[PDB]
Ligand binder design. Sequence first.
Ligand SMILES: NC(=O)c1ccc[n+]([C@@H]2O[C@H](COP(=O)([O-])OP(=O)(O)OC[C@H]3O[C@@H](n4cnc5c(N)ncnc54)[C@H](OP(=O)(O)O)[C@@H]3O)[C@@H](O)[C@H]2O)c1
Ligand SMILES: NC(=O)c1ccc[n+]([C@@H]2O[C@H](COP(=O)([O-])OP(=O)(O)OC[C@H]3O[C@@H](n4cnc5c(N)ncnc54)[C@H](OP(=O)(O)O)[C@@H]3O)[C@@H](O)[C@H]2O)c1
Ligand SMILES: NC(=O)c1ccc[n+]([C@@H]2O[C@H](COP(=O)([O-])OP(=O)(O)OC[C@H]3O[C@@H](n4cnc5c(N)ncnc54)[C@H](OP(=O)(O)O)[C@@H]3O)[C@@H](O)[C@H]2O)c1
Ligand SMILES: NC(=O)c1ccc[n+]([C@@H]2O[C@H](COP(=O)([O-])OP(=O)(O)OC[C@H]3O[C@@H](n4cnc5c(N)ncnc54)[C@H](OP(=O)(O)O)[C@@H]3O)[C@@H](O)[C@H]2O)c1
Ligand SMILES: CS(=O)(=O)c1ccc2nc(N)sc2c1
Ligand SMILES: CS(=O)(=O)c1ccc2nc(N)sc2c1
Ligand SMILES: CS(=O)(=O)c1ccc2nc(N)sc2c1
Ligand SMILES: CS(=O)(=O)c1ccc2nc(N)sc2c1
Lengths: 249, 250, 248, 249
Amino acid sequence: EAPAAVVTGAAKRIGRAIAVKLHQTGYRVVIHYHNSAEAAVSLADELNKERSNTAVVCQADLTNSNVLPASCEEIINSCFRAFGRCDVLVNNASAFYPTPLVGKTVETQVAELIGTNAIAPFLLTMSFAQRQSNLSIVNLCDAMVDQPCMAFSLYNMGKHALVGLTQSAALELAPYGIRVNGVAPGVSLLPVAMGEEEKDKWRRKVPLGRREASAEQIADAVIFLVSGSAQYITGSIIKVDGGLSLVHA
Amino acid sequence: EAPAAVVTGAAKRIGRAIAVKLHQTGYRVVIHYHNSAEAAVSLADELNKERSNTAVVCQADLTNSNVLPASCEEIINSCFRAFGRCDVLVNNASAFYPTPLVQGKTVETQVAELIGTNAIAPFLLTMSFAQRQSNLSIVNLCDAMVDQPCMAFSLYNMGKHALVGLTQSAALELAPYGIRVNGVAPGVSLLPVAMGEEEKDKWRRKVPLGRREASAEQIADAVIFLVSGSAQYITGSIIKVDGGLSLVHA
Amino acid sequence: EAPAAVVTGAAKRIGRAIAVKLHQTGYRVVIHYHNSAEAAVSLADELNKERSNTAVVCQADLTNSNVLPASCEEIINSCFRAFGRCDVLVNNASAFYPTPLVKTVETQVAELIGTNAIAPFLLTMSFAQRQSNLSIVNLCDAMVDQPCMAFSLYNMGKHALVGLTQSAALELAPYGIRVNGVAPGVSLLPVAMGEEEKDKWRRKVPLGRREASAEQIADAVIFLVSGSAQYITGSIIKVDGGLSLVHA
Amino acid sequence: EAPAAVVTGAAKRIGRAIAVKLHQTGYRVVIHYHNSAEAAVSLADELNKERSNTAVVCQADLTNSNVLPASCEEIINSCFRAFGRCDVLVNNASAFYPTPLVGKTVETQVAELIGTNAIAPFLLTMSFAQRQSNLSIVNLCDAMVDQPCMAFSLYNMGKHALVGLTQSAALELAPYGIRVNGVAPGVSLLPVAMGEEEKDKWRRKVPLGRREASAEQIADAVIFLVSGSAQYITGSIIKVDGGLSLVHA
Ligand SMILES: NC(=O)c1ccc[n+]([C@@H]2O[C@H](COP(=O)([O-])OP(=O)(O)OC[C@H]3O[C@@H](n4cnc5c(N)ncnc54)[C@H](OP(=O)(O)O)[C@@H]3O)[C@@H](O)[C@H]2O)c1
Ligand SMILES: NC(=O)c1ccc[n+]([C@@H]2O[C@H](COP(=O)([O-])OP(=O)(O)OC[C@H]3O[C@@H](n4cnc5c(N)ncnc54)[C@H](OP(=O)(O)O)[C@@H]3O)[C@@H](O)[C@H]2O)c1
Ligand SMILES: NC(=O)c1ccc[n+]([C@@H]2O[C@H](COP(=O)([O-])OP(=O)(O)OC[C@H]3O[C@@H](n4cnc5c(N)ncnc54)[C@H](OP(=O)(O)O)[C@@H]3O)[C@@H](O)[C@H]2O)c1
Ligand SMILES: NC(=O)c1ccc[n+]([C@@H]2O[C@H](COP(=O)([O-])OP(=O)(O)OC[C@H]3O[C@@H](n4cnc5c(N)ncnc54)[C@H](OP(=O)(O)O)[C@@H]3O)[C@@H](O)[C@H]2O)c1
Ligand SMILES: CS(=O)(=O)c1ccc2nc(N)sc2c1
Ligand SMILES: CS(=O)(=O)c1ccc2nc(N)sc2c1
Ligand SMILES: CS(=O)(=O)c1ccc2nc(N)sc2c1
Ligand SMILES: CS(=O)(=O)c1ccc2nc(N)sc2c1
């Protein structure tokens, strides 16, 4: 009957809004989370109140390790066990912090930034395909991949690797009827780790309305890509950045 | 109170699917046409017998010339005259034919039709649409294969590349005015009617997603998204609708 | 003998520096010019003092018109007439000014799309028809995907030039003609453009502790023409000190 | 004295030709190798015969692991130990093999394809910069990165990451006068394994002369980017693919 979606990093911000809107469209949802157990459970409760047994939570650290393949396998399995099926994977979870070229060890930075942003999406993608009729994956990419922030080399590397994943998996999974696409926010919901006037510095850069994307605006692009309106769309990355990537220095 | 859209080359194929779909969505439409007089009127009638006073036609030759600005200005004017408003512009019209570099039209006619229809008319139409002024947006029909061009199509590929520049330049410039500019990029959709079935199946075979061409309705779907309220933060984006064709290596 | 190069808009700045540097490598040069007769001739004198009968000038308006194809064909003719061969085409001439969306528009079109894209397409056609290390180098723009505001016709023309670079590289490859581009960022800024505006640009350039220079451009063209680039076609080299990498 | 350069994977094929041609230009070279011990030693013999004291070898495995930072630090150190300086880093070493999405473990595959192709280049770059004239880094990328081979997702993801590193490190290292650029082969020396019939299928696709690049042709591009003729060039990736990436399906 109803289709089923996995959303990684679904407890807060963008992943939350994606999970909410998938749910409003008639998806059952696996809300993946890492540290945000309260917000994840609270979201599952709200959604289950909307419609019974349509939302489960699943905890997994998506850092790269010897166990990441098992964790990703488990995330996919939990969808099939809760719901009988897995139609949609949304790779949203993301680590994001500076790694200057010139405080964790470098190898922890690699495991986190490359782990969450690229390897976990690869492993989730393999598990999703292996366990397989409007089947699709949506990766959360970055509209500013080709004009990186200074001292974010590892973050930028993982986001570029994700673009490669989207294109590679689109090609290889097409014969199986699995579409693979991305959504590339520019400035959306801003990190809490920064002062509220730096917030205004970015908002001023945005040609369209001089404001950041709501999480819902990102979720709208995701909804379109999983829908029947995108049945011939694969390997495409839709920028949702109000024209920010187009602005020169 | 119903919004209105201009669609160029709207009589047949993809532009028709776009007008039909924008109409089913509640838009009043200007069906622009060049040579397809019968097909244009036929479509405007069928649309008008759904909701009356919703579909007008507008004839224009979108070849580059010293009257092209006036014709583009007139397409836009058609929309305000019939409907009081211009909410959407879909640049769909396009000439497509080989122009070999090492070699029955003069080169300057080729420049005029391939760069005229594919780039200059969209720039002039864009200028008039912006000057004439809400969810305002423009959608340019681009080409997914623009960076892997067919042999001998340099002028056509040039026009489509120009159209990407326009898409990005105008998104940037018109953002302050609340006009979004985005594009939709087909790979293989409806093959040229001149094309033999044997040739058609060569193209079908290339496409990773189902070994078939996009339907026109599938192209139109992406245009509907881009103009909708679900795309209110998207400007300067070009969405490929090519079932993965642009990703296949030689 | 000595190979021969056409360089359009060779009289001043970057096309001059490209012309001198190809000459220093042993090329014979057609210095094309439009309004720059005195500068063009002064260049050819300088190069002819160095080796006689190695530099000719040529006048053409590269604005798009019914006579553009004739003018372009005559540019390639001048190189065969004077030197018995044409080995290298450098598409450097370029018009540059704003065309806000909100001089007639069709003159804007004829200049911005004509000189920047259509003349390069016609010259490319004439070059190819009239044929070994043969190559064309198109002067492209590194900021092509981050355009300046109100520069739509300019930006359209430089995108069209990227499509030409790619389409011509593919189609001419079976003839041993390579087609490539060099994309400056800010090099020598418009001599009419103000002074505080020019220091503002240098300040954003990552490799900016250096002067951007016309010779740095020419170096990249010299590379692409050379036997060190015999396998390179359809490539566009940015020479912009990292400027295209900097976000807003 | 003469400036110096580290070339990774320099024992054979493309890395060898880069090493020869940098030596020809007057560089002192560190020939990094993993398994190819005979080849590496023999190349340093030939270069030292030409000009004594100009060529050392350095063995390291460039697989990602918690010791990869020390190995990368060691390759850099070894150039300072032999020559007192390190002017040029060429990231050439690379694993390359299919990883279908539908006898190595997946974590070894990630370690080799993402380790060698991206993480080791990032650590080498970090070590190179920390230890610090015309300083520059050249990464070996892939002209086919947006038209990947089917079932090469992990490889393609690593090469995509390498593009991000190139751009990210050009921007960040620029104030220190270090330029970072890439050279992107299409078809060059075909894998030793692969059959002669497979070799001609690939040769037939190349618009420019229906042939693969010689290793020397790739090296020429490296030479250009390290020289004084490329001093305003940073963040650029030069395709050396005879037009291959331009060819549609
Ligand atoms: N927000 C923007 O402006 C913007 C701009 C460009 C791109 N994006 C992209 O859009 C996506 C979502 O944006 P966002 O701002 O909502 O992301 P975010 O808040 O920075 O992070 C999203 C979630 O990812 C999960 N995560 C982080 N580290 C993890 C680890 N080691 N293992 C497992 N999960 C982990 C976290 O879950 P828990 O809280 O459960 O620990 C976190 O809440 C990301 O892929 C991001 O890169 C966002
Ligand atoms: N078909 C595909 O597979 C495909 C692939 C890639 C991109 N696209 C793009 O998608 C869009 C729609 O595709 P399509 O195949 O439906 O286009 P098409 O059939 O080739 O042409 C669409 C319409 O353009 C009009 N047109 C042509 N030259 C004109 C001129 N000088 N002045 C005014 N109008 C002119 C024609 O209208 P009249 O009939 O009134 O003369 C024609 O019916 C195009 O922009 C195309 O470049 C299509
Ligand atoms: N300088 C930069 O910052 C920069 C940045 C990005 C890209 N570029 C590209 O690099 C190239 C050369 O740079 P540049 O600044 O030296 O060039 P430029 O000074 O802008 O002009 C190049 C020459 O082209 C000729 N030209 C202009 N309009 C013409 C027309 N309508 N007909 C015929 N010839 C015409 C002119 O020759 P006459 O003097 O004979 O009239 C002109 O001096 C250009 O293609 C440019 O787009 C430059
Ligand atoms: N060949 C092509 O047609 C082509 C096409 C596109 C891109 N490229 C790129 O160009 C560069 C060189 O090409 P190539 O064909 O010469 O590469 P290659 O022969 O496949 O490999 C170069 C060297 O990398 C080293 N290497 C591999 N795995 C390693 C590990 N785990 N640790 C340390 N070193 C390791 C090997 O050294 P040992 O032999 O010492 O074990 C190997 O000889 C590569 O970056 C490649 O991706 C090549
Ligand atoms: C504040 S931002 O627009 O630079 C940005 C950019 C990317 C990003 N990824 C995350 N997981 S949060 C985040 C925030
Ligand atoms: C090569 S194709 O047949 O998919 C193709 C590609 C572009 C194109 N543009 C038109 N106006 S019709 C058309 C057809
Ligand atoms: C914006 S710029 O000043 O770097 C620039 C950009 C492009 C350009 N083209 C010319 N012919 S002059 C010129 C100047
Ligand atoms: C033969 S190929 O052009 O598919 C190819 C492509 C990439 C590659 N990378 C290596 N390290 S060897 C190698 C061979």
